[PDB]
Design a binder for these strands. Structure first.
Lengths: 112, 77, 97, 365, 135
RNA sequence: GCUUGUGACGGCCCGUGAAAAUCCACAGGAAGGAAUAGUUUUCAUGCCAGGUCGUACUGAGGUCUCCAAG
RNA sequence: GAUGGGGAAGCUCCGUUUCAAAGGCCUGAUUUUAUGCAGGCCACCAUCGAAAGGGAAUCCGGUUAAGAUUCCGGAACCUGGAUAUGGAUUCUUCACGGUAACGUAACUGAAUGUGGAGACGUCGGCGCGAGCCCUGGGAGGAGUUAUCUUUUCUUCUUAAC
């Protein structure tokens, strides 16, 4: 039934000042300051937690290898695979609508 | 602190020449539910972190203490 | 009415439902007439229109959502695209619809 | 670096003082219409079993090369969907049980070669037990099949225990249950692990102490079965791993690789390979230890087998020496495909090869 | 009409080669015991041949025209079929079901494929296939 | 059960919900990379270093705040 | 709240991007009447303002007359910087598997364009976890007892990483 104090100088219950009451090897309870939790990286096109990317503190990405920060596709570490799929489809058909419009344009010029 | 469940790995660490001392820890433990036995723990202060070696066997322990470099300071318990 | 024209075929002739199966049918060239709902995704709509342009298939845009196409075929679920592999006792091919 | 090239080759003992080792071929096995994908030798040392994509399991001798036996599994052979992949003799002393993996099912054939004592010992071991295990039908009774274990996906590899009670089977694209431990004595199909790390290529039991080495595409994972956990994890320097083999004393390990590597893992030294050697021209298809003598082979896809001498020092803390011996050649390449398998003779320094040339070969000292 | 054919250009949508253009060498309309789904056997090119100007000479030109290919069994569900077409006759007997699942038959597949694509890029034809799909 | 932490939901709004330092990622395709150590180290192991100021105690009609047994 | 400007006899006030020449980077065989520097890229604005907002990383045990997340023993982590070795980069030039969601010991990526974290209102019930509380068995100690009571109390712990 041990009561527990803050360890750092901030006496307030802020976002940064969270507390875990941990039992120490001295047989007594003491507070542990909880590190602010890491979030999932998100789809820039989708708005969804993209798979296969490590979830770390922003600064913590500098230490880890590139195979924990990127999946193997094009737009790998920034998009969804669904949002990549959708823009492969989109860029293809837009590029082919350009061809059809040139065919119609060349035909109308020959008509005049 | 890091577990190495790997015999020659420990012996590679002992001959680093940046290592001053070693320690052999002896424990009293029991298997499954039946019988008590004796566990050894081969620990070296590595270059950065402490590496440890649980050997549940007593004969492999008997061989390993013998196999250590004689110039190295060995600590019981 | 189109509902009368379709429900006859679904109880009489060979058909298919959904995107993947219609595209498989277009690859086989065994599709005769495709039916596209209004609320279908623009990328999938353009992909079906282009695939039908390749296979040389007549294209019919169904006026109304996929719910109304499920109702038209007489099924509880929703369907984005319906094909006609085999035309039934109706003259659906030679008609405007 | 002003130096001679000669002082870059490591000081290795000359192969002449490490005899015996096989030099030339003696027994050419000409009988197949399809490529000999797999081999197996009996523990006693006469009955050499083969398998091909002509749907025909043939059993040969070692000294003559005469076809003593034939069984045909698939009837529409050239239908490319499923072929005979891996065959294994029972390591148990004098019972004569042959496993055959053809596509989605494993057929345990006990042949009419032997007689009554050894044969009915094998037969009673099969019928004692009474993926599913089926009673063989009339057509299956003709093909000498004692039991068929049918699965959903294609079996590609097989390996027994030291006893002959358990046999492990590996199916790629089976997902979770890609490694299965079967037992004949109870007809029990156990899936020993609740997950599988990606795609698995191989799995082989340790010689004596109870642990299984599941060999994935990228990893070799040492799994204890008395604790049902993971123990060690090998990181091969290579990327894609064809075949594994364990030293008969259970100290060391070799990995073959589709990306041309062959890696000597010491299970006492590190998690990395002790010695990476990358000499082959094509994919290293099969690497196997000899059981008695300190020797191992390496059969790649270039129609070339390289034989190695490997001393292992048990008591002393001294790293194992590996020296090359001879480049065995002569195998024919059939559409970018060399030697599909290699297996040593149990007691002497002879080696059984199997190429794409529809022909197995025996090498001699 | 079964448009998904032996000389048909496609755009890969999924997995490591997403965005990369391919050609279906041999379709499989109703799958196999391995791959129990309507798939296709493709041979596309990963590292695109980079642009070459009059300033580049003798060694850079050799570097730019170098193409790196890839072979993969791919599902129809991850393929975007294209209106375009490509000649395929040089490497139809090179890639099959036996070609896949057992290297180094994939290696000698990749060499014939590498040759065919480099020999077709040089003597400038089929330029749309060797341009980068911008997305 | 009390304290606290976290997850998926459901309400309450036209009330649509601080900023910046810092860190990571994607698209892009410039440039570079071999025959007595080619190019690349987001892989593993190894080396060195981290200044100034506050830091005692009290803090109980009469400033703020945390922990809370049966 | 300076600077540019504009007021004010003036002490100084207005104003915060304004009609300011507000600067910091790249390209090059050395720049063709012979050794005098040319071309391009970007377009907002100093600064102060939080010991309760955002923020890299430290715990346990021990130690004094009075100091502790600071000292000691042990065990850690973060950040920055040189560099050294092994591994990889495959027959030589930026790796592959999986239908796919994705997986991996790595697996170069300039200008420029973009995305995520930072990064966010309030309540309600429900799920799960940790601590506290209640309790059964057992291994020790203190107590009360004429009576009843296998009784009452206490110890049985596990930090960062």
């Amino acid at each position: 039934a041990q009561r527990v104090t803050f360890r750092r100088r901030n006496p307030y219950n802020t976002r940064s000042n969270k507390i875990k009451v941990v039992k120490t090897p001295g047989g007594i309870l003491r507070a542990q300051h909880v590190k602010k939790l890491a979030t999932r990286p998100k789809c820039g096109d989708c708005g969804s937690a993209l798979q296969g990317i490590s979830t770390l503190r922003p600064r913590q990405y500098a230490t880890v290898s590139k195979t924990h920060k990127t999946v193997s596709r094009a737009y790998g570490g920034s998009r969804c695979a669904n949002c990549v799929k959708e823009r492969i489809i989109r860029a293809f058909l837009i590029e082919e609508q350009k061809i059809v419009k040139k065919v119609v344009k060349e035909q109308t010029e020959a008509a005049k | 602190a890091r577990e190495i469940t790997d015999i020659k790995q420990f012996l590679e660490l002992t001959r680093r020449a940046d290592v001053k001392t070693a320690t052999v820890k002896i424990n009293k433990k029991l298997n499954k539910a039946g019988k008590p036995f004796r566990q050894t723990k081969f620990k070296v202060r590595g270059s950065s972190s402490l590496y440890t070696l649980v050997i549940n066997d007593a004969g492999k322990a008997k061989k390993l203490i013998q196999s250590l470099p004689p110039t190295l300071k060995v600590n019981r318990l | 009415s189109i509902n009368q024209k379709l429900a006859l075929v679904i109880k009489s002739g060979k058909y298919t439902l959904g995107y993947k199966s219609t595209v498989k049918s277009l690859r086989q060239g065994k599709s005769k007439l495709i039916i596209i709902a209004a609320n279908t995704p623009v990328l999938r709509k353009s992909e079906l229109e282009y695939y039908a342009m390749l296979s040389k298939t007549k294209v019919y845009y169904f006026q109304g959502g996929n719910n109304e196409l499920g109702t038209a075929v007489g099924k509880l679920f929703r369907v984005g695209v319906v094909s006609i592999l085999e035309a039934g006792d109706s003259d659906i091919l030679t008609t405007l619809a | 670096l002003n130096i001679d090239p000669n002082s870059l080759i490591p000081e290795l003992p000359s192969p002449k003082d490490l005899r015996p080792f096989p030099i030339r071929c003696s027994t050419i096995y000409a009988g197949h219409k399809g490529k000999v994908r797999t081999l197996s030798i009996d523990p006693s040392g006469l009955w050499l079993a083969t398998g091909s994509d002509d749907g025909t399991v043939r059993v040969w001798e070692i000294l003559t090369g005469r076809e003593v036996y034939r069984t045909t599994l698939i009837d529409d052979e050239e239908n490319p969907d499923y072929h005979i992949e891996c065959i294994e003799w029972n390591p148990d002393a004098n019972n004569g049980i042959l496993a055959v993996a053809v596509g989605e099912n494993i057929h345990l054939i006990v042949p009419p070669i032997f007689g009554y004592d050894i044969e009915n010992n094998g037969k009673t071991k099969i019928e004692d037990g009474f993926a599913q295990w089926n009673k063989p039908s009339q057509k299956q009774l003709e093909k000498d099949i004692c039991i068929t274990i049918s699965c959903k996906k294609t079996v590609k590899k097989l390996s027994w225990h030291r006893k002959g009670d358990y046999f492990v089977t590996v199916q790629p694209d089976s997902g979770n249950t890609s490694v299965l431990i079967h037992q004949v004595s109870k007809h029990l199909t156990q899936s020993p692990f609740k997950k599988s790390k990606g795609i698995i290529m191989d799995a082989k039991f340790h010689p004596f102490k109870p642990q299984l080495f599941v060999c994935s595409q990228r990893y070799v994972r040492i799994y204890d079965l008395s604790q049902q956990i993971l123990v060690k994890k090998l990181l091969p320097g290579a990327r894609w791993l064809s075949k594994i083999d364990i030293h008969p004393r259970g100290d060391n390990l070799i990995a073959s690789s589709f990306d041309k590597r062959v890696l000597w893992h010491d299970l006492d030294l590190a998690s990395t390979p002790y010695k990476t050697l990358r000499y082959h021209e094509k994919a290293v298809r099969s690497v196997n230890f000899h059981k008695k003598l300190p020797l191992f082979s390496s059969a790649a896809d270039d129609g070339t087998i390289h034989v190695f001498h490997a001393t292992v020092y048990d008591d002393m803390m001294k790293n194992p020496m590996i020296v090359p011996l001879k480049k065995l050649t002569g195998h024919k390449v059939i559409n970018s495909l060399g030697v599909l398998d290699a297996i040593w003779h149990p007691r002497e320094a002879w080696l059984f090869s199997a190429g794409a040339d529809n022909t197995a070969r025996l090498w001699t000292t | 009409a079964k448009f998904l054919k032996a000389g048909k250009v496609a755009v890969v949508v999924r997995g490591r080669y997403a965005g990369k253009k391919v050609v279906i060498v041999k379709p499989h309309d109703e799958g196999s015991k391995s791959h129990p789904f309507g798939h296709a056997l493709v041979a596309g090119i990963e590292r695109y041949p980079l642009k070459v100007t009059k300033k580049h000479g003798a060694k850079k030109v050799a570097k730019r025209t170098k193409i790196k290919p890839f072979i993969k069994v791919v599902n129809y569900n991850h393929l975007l079929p294209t209106r375009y077409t490509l000649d395929v006759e040089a490497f139809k007997s090179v890639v099959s079901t036996e070609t896949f699942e057992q290297p180094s038959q994939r290696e000698e597949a990749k060499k014939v494929v590498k040759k065919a694509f480099e020999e077709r890029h040089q003597a400038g034809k089929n330029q749309w296939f060797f341009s980068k799909l911008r997305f």
